[PDB]
């Protein structure tokens, strides 16, 4: 079993099985686990250990997945792990190992996540890429820890760079297609299905291959997805 988590523009948070049926209403099959205020975060992301991390008002938090909770109740109970600078991250996202990656000021960094706001995260983070990361439209991992990035509407994959001298984009593998920036959401499920959504949701089960995602044959939710601000799914540990 794995799940998609969706924040709507009404500030509700839903949990449900990934969509498979183009005519089905995915919301009908889903459970509301967050009641209100969930669209107020700048960032919301899963740790593969199953903890939810979130950035709201430039502060970073971690806590258990909510169980019919407002965003306010959740934040009040969460551990504060950062204060100042976090809202500016273009991307913040975990690898399958629970190592935090982040893009800020055009650069890519990784490090164990903070556990307190005294821990200046950038101060000891590993610089992976000195330039060009601020132009990506998406940047995310699969369950195997391959990195995926969209730039100039094209989707690239490759082992993540290990230091600033790895020319990642230069050595990466190119998907077919030049409309990958037209998705609002593009991510992997826990079980390695590639998901892309705008108003409609497209999903490719493994093997993913290198074909264009948004083919009529991969459509699993025809219409109605414009209601979600965020769709995420945890990677396994």
Author numbering: 13 to 249
Pull text from the paper.
To infer the ancestral motif from which tachylectin-2 may have diverged, we separated and aligned the five-sequence motifs of tachylectin-2 from T. tridentatus. Tachylectin-2 is a near-orphan protein, but we identified a sea anemone homolog which is 44% identical in sequence and essentially identical in structure and function. The aligned individual motifs were assembled in a phylogenetic tree and the common ancestral motif was inferred. However, because of the high sequence identity and unambiguous alignment, the prediction seems comparatively robust (34 of 47 positions predicted with ≥90% probability).
Propellers comprise four to eight blades arranged in radial symmetry, with each blade comprising a four-strand β sheet.
